[PDB]
Amino acid sequence: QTGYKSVDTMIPVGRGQRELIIGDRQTGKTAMAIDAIIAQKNSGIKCVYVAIGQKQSTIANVVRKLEETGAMAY
Amino acid sequence: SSGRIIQIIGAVIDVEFERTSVPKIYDALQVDGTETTLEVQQQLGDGVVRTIAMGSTEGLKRGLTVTSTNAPISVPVGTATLGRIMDVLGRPIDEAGPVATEERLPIHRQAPSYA
Amino acid sequence: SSGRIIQIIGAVIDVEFERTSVPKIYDALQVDGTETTLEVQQQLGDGVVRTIAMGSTEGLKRGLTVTSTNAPISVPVGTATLGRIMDVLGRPIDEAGPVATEERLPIHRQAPSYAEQAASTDLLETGIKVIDLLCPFAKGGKVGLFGGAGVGKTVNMMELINNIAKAHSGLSVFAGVGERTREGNDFYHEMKDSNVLDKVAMVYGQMNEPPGNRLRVALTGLTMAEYFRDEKDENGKGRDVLLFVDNIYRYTLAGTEVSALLGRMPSAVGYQPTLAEEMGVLQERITSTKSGSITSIQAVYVPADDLTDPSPATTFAHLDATVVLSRDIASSGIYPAIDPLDSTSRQLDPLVVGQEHYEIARAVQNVLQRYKELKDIIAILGMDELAEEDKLVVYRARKIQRFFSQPFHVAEVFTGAPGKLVPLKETIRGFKGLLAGEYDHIPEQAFYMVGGIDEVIAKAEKL
Amino acid sequence: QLNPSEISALIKQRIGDLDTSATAKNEGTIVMVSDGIVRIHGLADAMYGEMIEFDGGLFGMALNLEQDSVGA
Amino acid sequence: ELLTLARPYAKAAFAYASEQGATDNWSNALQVLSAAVQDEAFSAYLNRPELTPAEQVKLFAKVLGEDQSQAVSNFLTLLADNDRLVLLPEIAAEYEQLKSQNNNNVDVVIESAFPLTAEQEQLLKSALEKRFNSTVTVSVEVKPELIAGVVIRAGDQVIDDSALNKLEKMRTRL
Numbered sequence A: 001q002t003g004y005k006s007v008d009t010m011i012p013v014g015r016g017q018r019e020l021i022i023g024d025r026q027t028g029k030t031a032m033a034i035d036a037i038i039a040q041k042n043s044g045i046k047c048v049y050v051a052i053g054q055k056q057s058t059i060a061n062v063v064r065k066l067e068e069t070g071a072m073a074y
Numbered sequence B: 001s002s003g004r005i006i007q008i009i010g011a012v013i014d015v016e017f018e019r020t021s022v023p024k025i026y027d028a029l030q031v032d033g034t035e036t037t038l039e040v041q042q043q044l045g046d047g048v049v050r051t052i053a054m055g056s057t058e059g060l061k062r063g064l065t066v067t068s069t070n071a072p073i074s075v076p077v078g079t080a081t082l083g084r085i086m087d088v089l090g091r092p093i094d095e096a097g098p099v100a101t102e103e104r105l106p107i108h109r110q111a112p113s114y115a
Numbered sequence C: 001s002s003g004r005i006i007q008i009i010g011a012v013i014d015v016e017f018e019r020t021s022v023p024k025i026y027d028a029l030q031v032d033g034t035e036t037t038l039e040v041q042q043q044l045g046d047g048v049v050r051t052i053a054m055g056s057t058e059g060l061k062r063g064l065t066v067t068s069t070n071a072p073i074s075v076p077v078g079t080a081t082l083g084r085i086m087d088v089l090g091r092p093i094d095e096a097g098p099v100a101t102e103e104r105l106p107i108h109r110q111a112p113s114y115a116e117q118a119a120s121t122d123l124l125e126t127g128i129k130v131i132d133l134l135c136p137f138a139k140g141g142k143v144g145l146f147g148g149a150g151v152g153k154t155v156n157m158m159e160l161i162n163n164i165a166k167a168h169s170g171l172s173v174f175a176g177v178g179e180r181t182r183e184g185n186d187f188y189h190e191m192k193d194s195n196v197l198d199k200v201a202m203v204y205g206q207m208n209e210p211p212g213n214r215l216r217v218a219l220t221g222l223t224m225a226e227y228f229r230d231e232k233d234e235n236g237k238g239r240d241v242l243l244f245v246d247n248i249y250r251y252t253l254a255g256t257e258v259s260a261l262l263g264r265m266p267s268a269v270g271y272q273p274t275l276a277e278e279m280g281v282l283q284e285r286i287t288s289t290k291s292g293s294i295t296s297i298q299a300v301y302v303p304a305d306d307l308t309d310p311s312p313a314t315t316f317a318h319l320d321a322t323v324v325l326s327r328d329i330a331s332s333g334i335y336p337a338i339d340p341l342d343s344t345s346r347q348l349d350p351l352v353v354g355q356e357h358y359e360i361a362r363a364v365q366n367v368l369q370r371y372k373e374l375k376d377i378i379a380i381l382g383m384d385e386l387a388e389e390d391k392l393v394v395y396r397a398r399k400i401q402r403f404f405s406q407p408f409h410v411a412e413v414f415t416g417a418p419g420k421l422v423p424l425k426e427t428i429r430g431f432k433g434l435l436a437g438e439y440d441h442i443p444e445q446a447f448y449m450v451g452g453i454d455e456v457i458a459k460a461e462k463l
Numbered sequence D: 001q002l003n004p005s006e007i008s009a010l011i012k013q014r015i016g017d018l019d020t021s022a023t024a025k026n027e028g029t030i031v032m033v034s035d036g037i038v039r040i041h042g043l044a045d046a047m048y049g050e051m052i053e054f055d056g057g058l059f060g061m062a063l064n065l066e067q068d069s070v071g072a
Numbered sequence E: 001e002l003l004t005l006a007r008p009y010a011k012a013a014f015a016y017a018s019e020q021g022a023t024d025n026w027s028n029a030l031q032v033l034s035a036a037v038q039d040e041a042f043s044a045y046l047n048r049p050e051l052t053p054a055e056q057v058k059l060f061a062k063v064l065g066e067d068q069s070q071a072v073s074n075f076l077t078l079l080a081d082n083d084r085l086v087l088l089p090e091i092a093a094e095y096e097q098l099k100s101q102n103n104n105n106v107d108v109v110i111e112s113a114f115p116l117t118a119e120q121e122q123l124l125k126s127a128l129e130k131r132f133n134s135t136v137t138v139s140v141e142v143k144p145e146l147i148a149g150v151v152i153r154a155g156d157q158v159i160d161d162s163a164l165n166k167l168e169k170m171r172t173r174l
Ligand SMILES: Nc1ncnc2c1ncn2[C@@H]1O[C@H](COP(=O)(O)OP(=O)(O)OP(=O)(O)O)[C@@H](O)[C@H]1O
Pocket: A024, A025, A026, A027, A028, A029, A030, A031, A032
């Protein structure tokens, strides 16, 4: 589950897929991924993130957001 | 002790040193003749090192001696630098005489940690 | 007289030998430490050779001894492989125990000679509406499947598999070439529940191995198909066999990968200059012969739906039909979901298909393409403002689209897995009547998800 | 001639210290350094992807295996 | 290639030694150093990265013993500077070529199935003299795996009497 009506309806995702997100810059791809993570709060499955080529401030911001949701416990 | 030029192209220069002492990857180098300083770039090995120019490239001849400082570029720092205009080496150009600070800090350092 | 590891960079390997003892090209080299094997690519003088690693690229130590076989790569073949899945080396990867036969044959034979071309062109029918009407096949042909991601393409191939198996003792074979192993496993299990593996042989290259392996799986499948065709049974003529290419583009890319590291200079796109050489080598060993024939199906991928660059260009000069799948026809609920207007074959010819079938195909092309171009104005105004002419055309086109809806024989679960395999002649009859208008008085739904006129009329009467 | 030449080589130089006792196959010499790229003399024993330790205590990655040097 | 790289050095060395007649001494030194570089041990010791050109030069002087010269040392120095030490034997070979052509001598290599007697060898030397060369350098070779006859190679020039004739007849029949 991804929370996004369009995503959850038109192009689903199943446990084990290799789906890809693509687009131009500042398009919430970061945000979309984060929301995807949030959605699995109640799934019981686990979630892992990697940061590449980004200012540490960005990463710390993201981490703080996750803790604000408490998601950074699974 | 000292090294000397092998080749000159544009702003990139090479120095030959004894295997006993070869400069570290970033160090200030004093052309022992005219007024020019050099910054170490690569450890070309076998006593060979590659560098970049900090002034004009002229008067320089293949073989002229040059020394190391064993220290990278460090410029004056502090309030005494404020209200002043210094060069890329911290030398004044505003004709306000030398800067009255002796604190020195290198131009290279590590990125701040995540923590 | 054993060679040693002298230099390794990524995928290219080099070995020293005693100058008297020099391996020939394309012969296997035995890593004396591991089971990994090396194929000669070129001889570097002084007893130095260049090779590619068949197997893992781990455990490698500069100065490790390696031996040869002084013979090309040969793998076992014969009926003792049917329903078994092998590696690039012909080893059991299905954990079903070792292979039973010792009949081992090399993989680099030459293309069949000119004098031994099948002296006459042939034809193949599939019992499928759009194909047998608009995509005829010659036994020994070359078929391309372009695009298609909202539908089960593997379902289509498996339908063709059941087609040929029930149609002929001619067995089938598939090769995994950069296989999306999810789909490969799905296909494996679905053929399994079909209980049809006795006419099938499996080799997989699954995007996880050095480029040579995925290059050479094609040769493996080729060799299996060749030998199996060559088994002349009780008559002096063996069965005509069928091949499945997981993707030709990945075959191109396999060589494309390490070409530059081989010292090869780039090509017009940066590609390998030996592109056409290997391509022809591949295709020319796929033909129809004086005794027996071999044909194949090639699952084609297109980069960014662009055809105007060499990678599909070279391929096209070897196919015989361009089956281009259609997405929104699937959105129209059509089972086969194959475009009826872009797919063609060079086999559309009156001399080979007769005149009547050819001209029916002509007429249906015309009516469908004319209906397409009226879509806009119909949307703008409506059917009424068009002349009474072409209203029947619209109805006939819609009924044609319905008629194309063919329930699948083998899905096991799509509509009950009902086979149609209607004769070409019956479909000719039906489409002739529809073009004439024999039934241009019935809702198109009666033509939907059915086969011949008998089914259409029965459906129309039951409702 | 050939073998006499070899013996004379062993004569004018005895063993050459066994070439520093096979030059310590477990020792790698720092040769060429530029932009995080390390060239190493010796160390014939190498995997494609060894962990490479140093006097500084840090680590490198074994990537390029050459006839003469090592790219890390 | 490698021979191409070696060319100019051979020219220089030959010119100088001829101008000093010490050509024999340089040839002997060349053989010595070629054998030297052939040694894996000697090379590996030489290619140790902690050695300036002086180290390698003096090492070559030592292994040469009391045979070197100032011209020899200069030559070694220049080659060490560009590290062309590797392709030395080819330089020596070309140098031999130069002395042979200069003295107009031609070196001839002959393989026979059976070993030969000096009578026949002298006869062949005379015969190739009738082939109008100045002088000849004969190197014989027993090759009993060859069916019979003597095969003679003068550079690109070859003459056959052995199994090759048979190969020719078979290709002819086909
Ligand atoms: N669904 C949404 N609703 C409202 N705002 C959104 C939504 N998705 C993204 N945004 C906004 O878009 C802004 C920029 O997007 P973002 O920075 O996440 O893109 P990005 O994937 O990080 O791209 P880049 O990697 O180039 O930085 C964010 O500040 C966020 O507030």
